Design a protein around this ligand. Structure first.
Ligand SMILES: Cc1ccc(C)c(Cn2c([C@H](O)c3ccncc3)nc3ccc(-c4cnn(C)c4)cc32)c1
Lengths: 147, 141, 119
């Protein structure tokens, strides 16, 4: 007998270079028990505690003239307050100095447990999609699990 | 009454050289309700939504650049292909010692007979200081 | 199904909440398979002179020895943030106790919790 818990695990679209496009229609991605993917956002079908999680992976070749700040932010748009409240975020600086040019890899991971309401819209956003790495699958993903 | 959910929590072997070797014959390690451990892979006994998870802990004594990787993969019987579900790549860098835990998890639709691997590139960098540091599991929902 | 999910409060890591919370420890009420999970978040401002290691550990106090179930270590060395995630499935006994602890409650900061679910 299947579980009735709302869950989702969506993944970056690897041919959408220069963007972060979440897919549920791809090998090993899923929407279940009422969770929708609408306008690049996950939509919560019932109230409760959810674990939210996400990973993005950034990659560059050597360090450029201008200072690089990589961010990843998960936000919540409630029906009763329809503007992005940040739930989780992290900043990373992959580069100490300008390359005086080996690859660097900087992942950012965000997870937490939050109360959510029906109709909640969750977004998972980066500032620099030009540094995303879509080399193989499994690197960039976003999901929720009702507790 | 005991739960009939397929479950597994397997643990890395501290004395397998140049290898990430999963064990279930240890304390607080576990195969139950159909899950098998064959060729270092966990084998699913039935269709369903599963939680899947793995931790690995890397440790180096200083910095000369090193890349660390950690990947959970699926092989579906029906497709006979090997495909990543979760994957992390990470540059960790008198010599003071660094630690890098990588914890991979998510929920997935799995089919009867699927085989799952949890793999890294630098077994020489695994740390076994304490128990509980390197592990691999699945939980039917 | 027995479930708990507790969270932090200073000075220490104290958990404010048919699973009981006796002595900052969750107490198993029946024998079976449990999913157990936790996270903690550490904050500092700048790097100290003495080398700091942050650990986080979930232990099973059986029924009376004490053994790691899940554990990890981070080395942080401009403000910084380092989380630590733990989670897995375990066969437990009626009356076993579970601790989720850290070594440096001084660097402790949604993201700080501990819980178990009977499967
Ligand atoms: C993404 C993921 C997949 C599998 C597992 C075992 C975990 C472990 N876990 C953790 C763990 O701190 C973590 C790990 C990775 N991302 C976010 C959090 N917190 C949890 C908080 C809650 C739960 C939880 C409670 N019920 N269910 C069905 C899952 C698990 C939780 C995380």
């Amino acid at each position: 007998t299947p579980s009735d818990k709302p869950v989702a695990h969506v993944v970056a679209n690897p041919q959408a270079e220069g963007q972060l496009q979440w897919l549920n229609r791809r090998a090993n991605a899923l929407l279940a028990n009422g969770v929708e993917l609408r306008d690049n956002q996950l939509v919560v079908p019932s109230e409760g505690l959810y674990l939210i999680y996400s990973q993005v992976l950034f990659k560059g070749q050597g360090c450029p003239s201008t200072h690089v700040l990589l961010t990843h932010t998960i936000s919540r748009i409630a029906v009763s307050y329809q503007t992005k409240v940040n739930l989780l975020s992290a900043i990373k600086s992959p580069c100490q100095r300008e390359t005086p040019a080996k690859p660097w890899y900087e992942p950012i991971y965000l997870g937490g447990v939050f109360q959510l309401e029906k109709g909640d819209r969750l977004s998972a956003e980066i500032n620099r999609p030009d540094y995303l790495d879509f080399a193989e699958s499994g690197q960039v993903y976003f999901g929720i699990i009702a507790l």
